[model samples]
Target: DIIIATKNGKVRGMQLTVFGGTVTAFLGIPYAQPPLGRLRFKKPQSLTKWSDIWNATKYANSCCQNIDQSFPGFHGSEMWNPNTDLSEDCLYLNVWIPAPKPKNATVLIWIYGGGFQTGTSSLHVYDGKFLARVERVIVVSMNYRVGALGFLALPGNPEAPGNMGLFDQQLALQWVQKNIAAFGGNPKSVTLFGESAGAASVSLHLLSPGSHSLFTRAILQSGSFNAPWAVTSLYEARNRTLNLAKLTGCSRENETEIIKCLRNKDPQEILLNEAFVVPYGTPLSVNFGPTVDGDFLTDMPDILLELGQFKKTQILVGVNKDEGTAFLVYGAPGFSKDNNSIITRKEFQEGLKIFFPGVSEFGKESILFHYTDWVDDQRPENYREALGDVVGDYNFICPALEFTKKFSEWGNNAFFYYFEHRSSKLPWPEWMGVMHGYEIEFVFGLPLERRDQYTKAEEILSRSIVKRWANFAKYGNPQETQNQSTSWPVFKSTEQKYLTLNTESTRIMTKLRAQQCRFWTSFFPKV
Candidate 1:
């Protein structure tokens, strides 16, 4: 068997211009059997060999999911969310490779986030052909089942302990390791990268004993396994399943009835039944995501990090300038940004239980005082900015910073950055430069020719970010560039340094959320 030939089957991809350059696009390659009938909510089944030569030219149907009407104006990838059809039979992957095969090209795998509830690999922003042509590296993007169909955990049954979605990812990695070489990709040199929930998945894979050696490096953008909402407890996840069962006219009290009824319900009935809520009414929502199956996630991720039971893969991690600006903004339509912006001192105290369920009241008080910023409330606009800072630091920024510290302490190479560059494509206020997911388009090397329409700032910033990611994919480090505008330093015990990535100029900085991380690490000592 050569590149496209796996034990299960062979594929013939189409040649096309993708991501601004020419590459062979192998779309809709199935890695697992259909998760329908008895397989629903269970771990994906390994595929058996098929005799036909599969046509991997067009995309497979996206996983059975919602229309993604959650955000007021936020739609994924611009071209393919509502556009792509949906079905449970969608555990497929797409690959992009430079034409005229190159030897031993590094491999990069993209996992879309959508809070693990509403995402698809068919999104246009994930176009990998440009990246393949630009960096001369093979790129892989995949789709996994989402919503209740993918993550609903059952109680008392070890067979469907949950995290089937994550298992699907692991299976895809196994498929790649066994077959990527035929597509000019080196499985041994693979790097897993994603943002938000997708980034969180990359982090969980880092801890999984089963996921070791499947990939040697990872790039986590804005989310990590330690993020508060990343992984739900087994009890909580099971309760959600019960609630869903009751909603679907199934027996919530009986395990057998629950599984059978849920398996029989329409996927649309399963996904559209509930609203995914965030803590403190932060506005953005995430439904049932990765659950703690004793087998995949033996303990809390923070605990796992403390036990030093991780892959110790080379890593590049960072966050956007105002991660919560879009989710927790004053003018956003999803939530009343103006009316519910501030985490007032009193409200902050009340919200601590939700934010730090495990911490003592005194510990929560310490966190509150450290994040207090009441002086700016005299001006309305300034108050929202202050509140945004608090939310962003607490949820996204601080956790990322803490993880970098943990990885560095664990004797792993860590490269960190703060993405502050705002592309002219966006018209948000200067105060809110580069909100979450904004850096993604640049990461995939978008606007190839349109780069000229933008100022030199964005062009150089685009080049720097793309090459850095490509460089990290090719070599474990996002090493210094030819001009060395700014060197992304490896996190060391001697002194923790990070790259401040922007259009004006990139700089080596230290401790992005220093005071914030200090407060967090003190209470959540293990993470």
Candidate 2:
């Protein structure tokens, strides 16, 4: 264990007993003053100097969240202990480093995803030890307030301003910039990587003015910024919080008083009640998501990217083959509903009109036909693949491609890939191949139920991706060699190149434009 002095007090960390060596780990390091009492809803404050030693071995408790059976697998229930109390003192970070007295090494800061409403760095699946050891990178993960506590925007409360969660993230980066050298990490080579909501948060940070100097590169797995529902506005956020207060029987007369009442209520009770009003599908149904706060996020991502306002950082973005199957696994079947079950073309057309009113009328038939017949009409064995494309194209792939095209046009190095390996242990409906998040297990090299899930063919593909990711971290470009499988081309408007990872082969292809990029770009303009 090592004791480090901070402005607030002395901080302590644990020593991990690993293969014939000791690795120092620091947990629950407060980067910002607790956002409690008078500090609620305000921009985070820097820690003040103190003389006491702070214990950092155990993880801090996660912020308040509703427990549902369908909650994403990455966000487990371990953080919530009914016996131990919950509090507003949830702004903390955890660090894992293999070296004691360290020299400069690449830093990987991980952000966990729980739809922005639930998630913490302590989840089992997010164990960063293997990645840290294999890649020889310093790994840092943090627990930020989630749900209402982290994102609530109140009316006229100067302290409880909007987007406190993002502010907390910025504060963590500031802490890394100031002190990561003690952990043997190169602050200049920091890479921010995450999945789903965490990936979306990284996207938000790329466009956020407050996060400009915090990271050098990014890896967005299975998520991006172009989702239709990623809007954040002070007016709308405040309105929602006020409605929540009213629904919970809290007086709306005094903003501070209402916050106090809401904070004092049982966290689980608040979560369960709030879940009733916020449904599962609509954008707002996912609570604690980013809002278009005037200060932190000045504008939407599309507006910033189109206007050439974002920082020119290199990025690697991709999605799983069955990105939406997990949502279905959680019991929301909208994406998996069979088009053949509609009984009539007219009914299917109507459904298309209602579901996708933004697409052109002339193109609706083609879109619906492709979605119904070409995408999902196959046997059940192929249903997962089609659903994967549906969710991947709609939520992650298309947005990433469009963003990549724009970045390439503006002279930035951008790369994309497709992760298609399946874990046999977590077998999906036979039709659902390579469900969402399956690639994470292999990417981080975790041992799961399927020992021989991938043949030698697949192992080579995994090696290619891991090497490319490492090369990207070392240098900005993902291309590391001149070999056929290793030679990935830069994306250009004319060639529109991409790297594809599959069971049979790992190669660069111009076919991605024909796959779905062209159609999705038309739907979501490059501007």
Candidate 3:
């Protein structure tokens, strides 16, 4: 048993051997007082120092979330949901430090992504043991509140100001600043990284004034605050809060009464009622997510980026090849359980309307015309792929490209990539391509777990990815040494250079989907 003394208290951790080294595993350390009862919709509060040596040996409960096992995805949808039980008293964070505890090691903090509705740090895929052991860098991950419980915004209501989840993450960063030194890690060399909604949180931290001093660098994978689905206005958030209140039979006449009534209700009831606010099939328009709180988010995200109102830290941001493929099954009614699913032209048009409910008729027409393949517009195969492109470009691809371009233009060191590797283990059809969240396995070094299951090329790619990530965290650049052949270049608006990551060949490329991004940013009205 290895005992480390932190500012909060002393905790004991266990050691486990990996392929190359040993890692001290400290699991489920509470960074904040549990957000329960009256603190349900409130920001996380600081924890009082515990006198006892807390036994930090096992994972804790994940924040209460509605888990639908039947939800279709990889491995029966088990990869996404929480591995532990769900509860309101969940604001714990876990840490993994490489043994023999090297001094001044870089720290990489992970934030999991589940559309800001469902995610837990305790998931097997997100385990930081491999990353910490292989790279000799400390890894940390935290569990935050999600869905209505995490992001119900009521304007002027101090009790529930929204973005509680982001606040939870901020509190975790604070814990790292104060306590990571005890675990032999460098506090100043923190790298904040995440995927999807978690990536959106990382982007928000870059822009938010409160989170500026927490981390020195960031790694954003396939998400951005500028994305249409990432954020909503204060007005919309207020309306959704009231709608949730009414659904739960809470009085909406006054703020105090609304919060009090919500506090008195059972946690599961509120989680069940979330279906009304966040629909089942529509994954994009998650209205109850991060909002423009006057404090947390002073202004709109795009406006903040345009004015260079964000931290000028080193950033590595990128997106997958076909991010919207998995979303098509969740959002578009055209795709179904059938393996040979082909979207018809009529169904494709209907999907656009459903996707962009606010867009005018002419706007939809232009979007359709740009994405449609003119050569074979009548073919069913053409419409199916075209629909995926529309979804991908609008939500994940364009927003990330625009955000990275702005970061580079502001004189910040920005490294960009386009992930095009499709794992052979994925059960989905080839037409789906490299879907969302697929790159996470490689990032966490999962390929090395079972060498027999993964190909030699995959294992090599994973090692390279882990090394590059660690190098970026340590020195603010992915390229540790001056290898002209494999060295990644800095992204700029002029050339639009980015690394194309794949098992077949990982090399630098320029102008990826340049035409589609231009149409989305320039021609599309107010994207």
Candidate 4:
């Protein structure tokens, strides 16, 4: 038993071996008071100190989310989801510390991403044991409310100001600041890292005034605040909340009344009603994610970055080769012209319209050439793969590239990479390339059941990734700890350098996708 004393109370953790050594695994520790009943939809609250030795052994329940074994995205749900029950009272976080806890082990906090609707820290892919052991860093992950339950922006004045999930993350980081020392972690060297929605959360934290001191560095993978689904305006989500309110009898009359009525209703009814408000993947997917609350998110991310409104903390960011491939699997199994296909003249025009409302026909056609030059393919998979390319660039690739470019030009210590490594174990077709979330395996050095099946080169790449990640957390730069043999340069605006990570042979590339990114960024404002 590994005993540790925290500010809340004394808890016991267990031991597990990894990275050729042993580590202390603290499964599920509640960083905040439960967000249940009246506490629901509100910012997280701190826990009152307890005298009892909380048995921090087994994993706790995940936050409220819809999970049908028959859903379109269910295969991924089972692949990434933690095999834990769901509950409203799920604000718990897990931690893994290297053996022989020191007074100052660098900390890494992982925020999972499921389109800000369906991610829990309870996934085998996100387990902190391997990262903690290999990197010799304190790895922490937490559960936050998602979907309508966590992000409904009602007509209340700051009472239900929305972004409760992000608030939960902030509260968890606060707990780390105060209690991580007990677990032998350094409060000063905290690194917030995540993929997809989690990456967007990391970017949101950068823009948040309150989050300035919560983390010293960040690692963003395949997502950012400017992504189409990452954010929505207050007015845009109002209708969804209204429909939800009327359905549950949470009237639109007054502020407190609406919130009170919502609280009184069963959590199940509200979450289930989410299916009605844009589930996941559609032509114009509307996510009930973070909103532009006047307080937390004073302005849009694009404006914030341009004005240098974000904290100048160090950042390392990148996106996968096919960041949008997973989304093609979101709506229907196959793709067609109806879901806004891009393999035609008018089809491309209308499809881009969904994203860029007032985009010109020339703009749409220009964007189409980057992905395809249609030759009449009613075949769904062909369009599906092309859809993945278009969606990947529009959703993740372009946004990340622009964000990193602006970040570097702003004179911040920043580095960028383009993850092109495709997993042999990944079931994705070669045409789909490296889809979103595929990098998590190498990021965590996953020791899968058929771990031996992974090529020897992959294992080497995983080791290098883990080592560089640890080095980045220790110092502000990933290159600071890299070997002299391989030089990963900082992202500079003049040369526009970015590391192209591949297990076979990693190398740096200048102007990797210079033409496509320039054209894409031309339409969207400084975002």
CA RMSD per model (angstroms): 3.8, 4.7, 1.9, 3.8
**Clashes (candidate 4):** 1
Give the per-residue lDDT of model 4 (tens digit) for 1-527. 77889988898899986646898888889888897777877878889788988887888888878764534454543686547888888889998998878678999999998877787887878888888776679999989889877888863455577889999999898889988988889999999999999999999999999899988999999888987778888776787777777777777587667877888888788977776754333633545888888767887778998888898977899988877665544443333322433344444345455555555666666666665655765654455556566777777888887788787777887788888888877754565578789899888877332345887778777777777777888998785244553677888878878887887777888876676666667853432
Q: Which stretches of candidate 2 lie over 4 Å from their true place?
A: 1-9, 17-22, 71-87, 154-159, 233-236, 251-261, 277-284, 332-367, 373-388, 447-464, 479-485, 502-504, 511-527
User: How accurate locally, in lDDT, is each candidate?
Assistant: 0.76, 0.66, 0.87, 0.78
lDDT of 2 by residue, 65-134 (tens): 6555533343322332221235567778888777564588788788877676777777655666655655
Q: Which candidate number would show the highest TM-score if scored against the true structure?
A: 3
TM-score of each: 0.89, 0.83, 0.96, 0.90
Clashes by residue pair, model 3:
none
Q: Please, what are the lDDT tens digits per residue for candidate 1 over residues 1-527?
A: 22467667778888886545568888989999998997888889988788889988888888987763433464322433534788999999988888778788899999888777778888777888888888888889888888788888774475456788898888999988998887777888999999988999999999888889899799999888877667877777766777776677886565666787777888888877745322222344455778767777877888878778789768999999888766544323322422444444454454444435566777766655665555654654553454456567777887787777877787889998888877777645555547778888778877564634766566667777888898888788896569756667897745778888876777888767766677665654543
Q: List the residue pairs that clash in candidate 1.
A: 3-182, 18-130, 19-130, 330-337
> Which parts of model 3 are misplaced by more than 4 Å?
70-76, 278-281, 374-380, 480-485
> In terms of lDDT, which candidate is strongest?
3
Predicted structure 2, TM vs. truth: 0.83
Order the numbered candidates by TM-score, best leading. 3, 4, 1, 2
Model 4: residues >4 Å from true position, as ranges? 68-77, 278-286, 332-366, 373-385, 447-452, 480-485, 524-527
| Candidate 3 lDDT tens digits, 1-527 | 78999999999998888885789999999999999877888999989988888888999889988775655465736778788989998899999999998799899999998888889999987989999888889999999999988998886688888899999999999999999999999999999999999999999999889999889999999998888788978777877888788899996677888998888999888888887864333657575699888878888888899989999989999999999888777667668545656877798898887787777889899988888757865676787788888889889999999999998898988999899998878766788889999899899998977754977788878888888899999999887363333778999989989998888777889877899999998889554
Candidate with the larger lDDT of 1 and 2: 1
How well does candidate 3 match the true structure in TM-score terms?
Answer: 0.96
